[PDB]
Enzyme design. Structure first.
Site: not given
Ligand SMILES: CCCCCCCCCCCCCCCCCC(=O)OC[C@H](COP(=O)([O-])OCC(O)COP(=O)([O-])OC[C@@H](COC(=O)CCCCCCCCCCCCCCCCC)OC(=O)CCCCCCCCCCCCCCCCC)OC(=O)CCCCCCCCCCCCCCCCC
Ligand SMILES: CCCCCCCCCCCCCC(=O)SCCNC(=O)CCNC(=O)[C@@H](O)C(C)(C)COP(=O)(O)O
Ligand code: SF4
Ligand code: SF4
Lengths: 208, 113, 82, 381, 96, 114, 176
Positions: C38-39
């Site tokens: 995930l960012d």
């Protein structure tokens, strides 16, 4: 040189030289240069940490009393590492005089806001944010004032083109004024007007 | 004489300008005594404040004191003395008699480029 | 706000309504950055979805340190009694 | 909670009001709606080419801004105009002052509701635009006052018509002043409205009537005098309360004193040339352009390259009718400016609009935007 | 100027001023639209002798700004000018 | 090489400011789609805010990301306060512009631009 | 050298107080304003009968552009490009070549009248009085590109308006 030559005012020249000595010796912490032009205008070139101590001095000292902020200006000079040159034009009504206070910054160093000294600056240096990108710290409402709301870039920087990068037109598909990349029907024609012969030997810079 | 108005808007008439200027000038000198002696601000401000205070102590009249203090109405002379007092209180904190904080870059004030 | 199993199932309900997290790969102890991929802004909007569900403002210093849903449910347990 | 209105652009101005019923708690003027990037376009054009931009800044005070820019360039050139050009500049500067104060007073009355002295005084303003068209060929933007003097000599019989105008114009001021000054409705719209203290007026960068309405005795034609204002005799009106009514009376009295100056300039116009007799700055006559070799070379080089201005920075401020109008001109030694900051009084006045409209009402905002004579061309550049 | 004396008298009574002495409409008292041709004077530099440009040059007598202080006794405290002389009240019409 | 800071002392305070600015934009996007009555979905506006944050992700200078946070605050102030119109909000969505050629071959076909 | 507007003190005897109360209760200055408006009712208005009556102009007036000819039919313009060099709007575009008899003449002489600022630097820069900004101000168009004049339109303006342009230059050239 009587009819066509502007007469020199040596009285105001000697007075502004004496007052420049005065300001240079009262405030040696920030005053870097003091110069008087040939048409008798005084410039105090200071360090950007002393924007508030110099401008509060000239506003409040009884020999200065520079109560009025005439103008606040930035000048873009890209050949400097501190490209922006912030100019304060001050008017004393008691001594009928004008003084120029000049400091400097690059793109990333903030300059301390002089709204504590002159509230007139509340728009002026705000304009300097809109036009030049010079941030002013501890400003009450710092935002763009003259350009359009979604405008990217700072127009009075000299690496910014004469036209923009975008132009507006009404589009009937989206029923809306839209921005598109700028395309001129006729290019702005750059003229090379500089004469290759030296005009002023007094301003001759020494070579390398 | 009871000058009815100063002429300037927002600046009320001070009833006793002589005692007010004496208090403000001695308070300027008392605040100004905290500055080191080699500072030029202390010497120049003591000089102009002593000239103004000797002129205030020399004259009983308000209006001739206005024509020889050479600063307009007496109430804006009072207001300038207040501004000088606040300035000296700032100049103690700023300490600007020190040497230069930083030399500029080499071509920083060279014009034309 | 009463039972820890209800809070943990509600955190998992928030994370399974989140489209970018794989529901099969999601566990209680899975890290957001190096497991789920995930960012950082994904984790930030996860924390804002937790504020939408549980209804209290989470500050910045203690939302950066929430790197697994176990840390999230322990943070909500530490901001409550349970 | 409190009300928030957006008096939008339906010059032009956007206003964001924070109101508390009838009162005004906060006034945010959103401007930039006439920002055209004038002082970036000046940087790519020569000094003669940058001159007609100054006509269009304060577009009711054209020859005044021409005069301020011409004085800036002549200061950097170390040359001076001939005396006749100086008297013509002061003459048309005071005619320009009459133009601007008619615009100011009659639109300030039009916005409040007195729509009639507008029509009464724009006939006089039409006659002064005929004076501009006779002297230069255009009715508003003359491009007449140039660095070195003016462009062209007065046509024969123009001063007799300026006499016939100035003889009758005081009755027009008197009937304007009959309609508005003792009028109780005009006084009720302007007496308690926008009281500006003198210290805040000096601090906010106010200039002109915005200072002199508050009792500050400052006029740049007296204290820092330019072309022949030390040779004319006039009085400077001073207010007492710092309100809209004193600023109205100051503008009416500045029309009176401008008529006085125009009478003195008509009676004291000297003979002589109207450009500087340096043909390296001001262009030669067309009769000697077509006969002399030096004059043809100088005509060619002035109308293609232009004069080189020596490197230097100046702030030249004049007393425009709206106040101190300044040009901060930076020259790098070429025939084009490096920088031209344009200080205009309406920018600082519209910055002080927020303090001037505290505790007032919504229909007092239009009176305060009237007492600051705000032309948004000079504000937004 | 074409109004009859009844309307002219009503007009001067209603205004309270003598309006025919100062009419805001222009008539034959203006200048002619066709003028005799001028002969404009030459300036002071139109001379055949003693007229070298090196003795009347303005742009080349301007100097660079003299540097008063740069970073490379009991002297009087100074001001940028003497203080401004107090304005005298008008004798023409001071409203006093 | 010692400079005066704007707000942040290192990169972590700056990432704190970027994070709070992104939070404020993420909260604002539904109100922006609502009161401007935009034709975009809330997810699409949030993807545009994610794109505009990830456009500047390569910056490793604290002062530059300080000025980016300040300019994002100014854009958010112009969005919350209804100072922008619908046109200024939709200028982020370059709708009426043509798709630009991406590969070598179509750029070779349409003109001279690299 | 200064005067105080609005620094009069009103009198306080019974005469002047009753005068101010009569002015309040009997609306005397409002009747003065009605009298001034009634005075202008019975004046001749300043209204001219346009299109049949025209506002007064001068021979210096800067209207529509035109290209003049010598009194032999030869056009005055010799392609020196001073007028597009001095044009503050860059409204003039000129291209030139030698024509069949060797004369220095233009092939393109365009003035974008929508860019033009009508300041007349082109007529005062022109060393041969070729481009003039003549008397015509009634040349409004229904289309934008009709205000983009090429050389043929400007030469037709010169042929149309020469009888008036030459008389205005005759009346004005001694001031120039
Ligand atoms: C009040 C009611 C009207 C009474 C008549 C009247 O007052 O006539 C105006 C007449 C002209 O007034 P003026 O301001 O001196 O005009 C001078 C002009 O130079 C005189 O004008 P001029 O020299 O330019 O001459 C041309 C003018 C000559 O003027 C007239 O013919 C006047 C109008 C007469 C009807 O004729 C016209 O313009 C033709 C106008 C035709 C229509 C007039 C209106 C008709 C109204 C009923 C329907 O007024 C007077 O003579 C004073 C008042 C008389 C009161 C009469 C008793 C009531
Ligand atoms: C509706 C549409 C409206 C559009 C909204 C436009 C506003 C956009 C404002 C832009 C603000 C910025 O770009 S400041 C961000 C620049 N940050 C940096 O250069 C530092 C690197 N930052 C990051 O990588 C960020 O993702 C984080 C979250 C701070 C850290 O992630 P990393 O760790 O993994
Ligand atoms: S009048 Fe001025 S703007 Fe118009 S074409 Fe001539 S020089 Fe250009
Ligand atoms: S119109 Fe005149 S200035 Fe322009 S190119 Fe022709 S001859 Fe030269």
């Amino acid at each position: 040189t009587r009819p066509t030559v502007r007469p020199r005012n040596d009285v105001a020249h000697k007075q502004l030289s004496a007052f420049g000595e005065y300001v240079a010796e009262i405030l040696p912490k920030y005053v870097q240069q003091v110069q008087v032009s040939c048409f008798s205008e005084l410039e105090i070139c200071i360090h950007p940490d002393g924007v508030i101590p110099v401008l509060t001095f000239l506003r409040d000292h009884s020999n200065a009393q520079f109560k009025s902020l005439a103008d606040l200006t930035a000048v873009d000079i890209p050949t400097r590492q501190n490209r922006f040159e912030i100019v304060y034009n001050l008017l004393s009504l008691r001594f009928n005089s004008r003084i120029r206070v000049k400091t400097y910054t690059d793109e990333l160093t903030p300059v301390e806001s002089s709204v504590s000294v002159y509230k007139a600056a509340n728009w002026y240096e705000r304009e300097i944010w809109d036009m030049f990108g010079v941030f002013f710290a501890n400003h009450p409402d710092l935002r763009r004032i003259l350009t359009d709301y979604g405008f990217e870039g700072h127009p009075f920087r000299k690496d910014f083109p004469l036209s923009g990068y975008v132009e507006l037109r009404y589009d009937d598909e989206v029923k809306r004024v839209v921005a598109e990349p700028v395309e001129l029907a006729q290019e702005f024609r750059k003229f090379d007007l500089n004469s290759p012969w030296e005009a002023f030997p007094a301003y001759r810079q020494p070579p390398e | 004489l009871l000058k009815k108005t100063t002429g300037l808007v927002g600046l009320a008439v001070c009833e006793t300008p002589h005692e007010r200027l004496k208090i403000l000038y001695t308070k300027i000198l008392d605040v100004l005594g905290h500055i080191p002696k080699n500072a030029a601000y202390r010497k120049y401000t003591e000089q102009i404040t002593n000239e103004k205070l000797s002129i205030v102590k020399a004259e009983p009249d308000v209006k001739k004191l206005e024509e020889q203090l050479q600063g307009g109405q007496i109430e804006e002379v009072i207001l300038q003395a207040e501004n000088e007092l606040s300035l000296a209180r700032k100049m103690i904190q700023w300490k600007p008699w020190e040497p230069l904080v930083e030399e500029p870059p080499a071509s920083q004030w060279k014009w034309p480029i | 706000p009463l039972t820890l199993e209800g809070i943990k199932d509600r955190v998992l309900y928030v994370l399974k309504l989140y489209d970018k997290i794989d529901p099969e790969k999601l566990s209680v102890n899975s890290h957001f950055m190096k497991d789920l991929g995930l960012d950082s802004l994904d984790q930030v909007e996860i924390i804002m979805a937790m504020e939408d569900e549980f209804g209290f403002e989470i500050p910045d210093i203690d939302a950066e340190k929430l790197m697994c849903p176990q840390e999230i449910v322990d943070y909500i347990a530490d901001k409550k009694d349970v | 909670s409190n009300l928030t209105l957006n008096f939008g652009p339906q010059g032009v101005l956007r206003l964001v009001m924070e109101l508390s019923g009838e009162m005004v708690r906060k006034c945010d003027p959103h401007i930039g709606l006439l920002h055209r990037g004038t002082e970036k376009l000046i940087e790519y054009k020569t000094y003669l080419q940058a001159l007609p931009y100054f006509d269009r800044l304060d577009y009711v005070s054209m020859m005044c801004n021409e005069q301020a820019y011409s004085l800036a360039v002549e200061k950097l050139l170390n040359i001076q105009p001939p005396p006749r050009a100086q008297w013509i500049r002061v003459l048309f500067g005071e005619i320009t002052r009459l133009l601007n104060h008619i615009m100011a007073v009659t639109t300030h009355a039009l916005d409040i509701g007195a729509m009639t002295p507008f029509f009464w005084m724009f006939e006089e303003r039409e006659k002064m635009f005929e004076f501009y068209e006779r002297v230069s060929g255009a009715r508003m933007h003359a491009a007449y006052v140039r660095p070195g003097g003016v462009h062209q000599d007065l046509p024969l019989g123009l001063m007799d018509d300026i006499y016939e105008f100035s003889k009758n114009f005081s009755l027009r001021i008197d009937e304007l002043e009959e309609m508005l000054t003792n009028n109780r409705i005009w006084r009720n719209r302007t007496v308690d409205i926008g009281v500006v203290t003198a210290e805040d007026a000096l601090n906010y960068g106010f200039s002109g009537v915005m200072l002199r309405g508050s009792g500050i005795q400052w006029d740049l034609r007296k204290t820092q005098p330019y072309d022949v204002y030390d040779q004319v005799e006039f009085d400077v009106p001073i207010g007492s309360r710092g309100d809209c009514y004193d600023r109205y009376l100051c503008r009416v009295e500045e029309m009176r004193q401008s008529i006085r100056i125009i009478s003195q300039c008509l009676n004291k116009m000297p003979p002589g040339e109207i450009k500087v007799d340096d043909a390296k700055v001001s262009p030669p006559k067309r009769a000697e352009m077509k006969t002399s070799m030096e004059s043809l070379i100088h005509h060619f080089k002035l109308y293609t390259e232009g004069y080189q201005v020596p490197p230097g920075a100046t702030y030249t401020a004049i007393e425009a009718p709206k106040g101190e109008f300044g040009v901060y001109l930076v020259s790098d030694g070429s025939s084009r400016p490096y920088r031209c900051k344009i200080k205009a009084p309406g920018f600082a006045h519209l910055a002080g609009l927020d303090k001037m409209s505290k505790g007032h009402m919504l229909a007092d905002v239009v009176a305060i935007i009237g007492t600051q004579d705000i032309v948004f061309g000079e504000v937004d550049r | 100027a074409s109004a009859t004396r009844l309307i002219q008298g009503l007009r001067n009574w209603a205004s309270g001023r003598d309006l025919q002495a100062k009419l805001q409409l222009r008539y034959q008292e203006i200048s002619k639209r066709t003028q005799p041709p001028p002969k404009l004077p030459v300036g002071p530099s139109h001379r055949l002798s003693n007229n070298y440009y090196c003795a009347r040059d303005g742009r080349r007598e301007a100097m660079p700004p003299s540097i008063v202080m740069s970073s490379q006794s009991e002297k009087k405290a100074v001001s940028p000018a003497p203080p401004i002389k107090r304005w005298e009240l008008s004798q023409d019409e001071p409203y006093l | 090489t010692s400079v005066k800071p704007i707000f942040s002392r290192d990169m972590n305070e700056a990432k704190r400011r970027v994070r709070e600015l992104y939070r404020a934009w993420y909260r604002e996007v539904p109100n922006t789609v609502h009161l401007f009555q935009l034709d975009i979905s809330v997810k699409q506006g949030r993807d545009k805010v994610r794109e505009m944050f990830k456009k500047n992700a390569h910056v490793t200078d604290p002062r530059v990301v300080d000025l980016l946070v300040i300019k994002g605050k100014m854009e958010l102030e112009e969005t919350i306060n209804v100072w922008k119109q619908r046109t200024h909000v939709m200028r982020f969505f370059h709708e009426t512009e043509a798709p630009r050629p991406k590969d070598f071959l179509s750029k070779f076909y349409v003109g001279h631009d690299p | 050298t200064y005067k105080y507007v609005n620094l009069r003190e009103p009198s306080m005897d019974m005469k002047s107080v009753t005068d101010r109360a009569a002015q309040t209760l009997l609306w005397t200055e409002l009747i003065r304003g009605l009298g001034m408006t009634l005075s202008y009712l019975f004046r001749e208005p300043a209204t001219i009968n346009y299109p049949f009556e025209k506002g007064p102009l001068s021979p210096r007036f800067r209207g529509e552009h035109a290209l003049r000819r010598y009194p032999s039919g030869e056009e005055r313009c010799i392609a020196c490009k001073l007028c597009e060099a001095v044009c503050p709007a860059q409204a003039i575009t000129i291209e030139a070549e030698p024509r069949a008899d060797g004369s220095r003449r233009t092939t393109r002489y365009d003035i974008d009248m929508t860019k033009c600022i009508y300041c007349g630097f082109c007529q005062e820069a022109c060393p041969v009085d070729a481009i003039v900004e003549g008397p015509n101000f009634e040349f409004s168009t229904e289309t934008h590109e009709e205000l983009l004049y090429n050389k043929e339109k400007l030469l037709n303006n010169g042929d149309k308006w020469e009888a008036e342009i030459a008389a205005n230059i005759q009346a004005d050239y001694l001031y120039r």
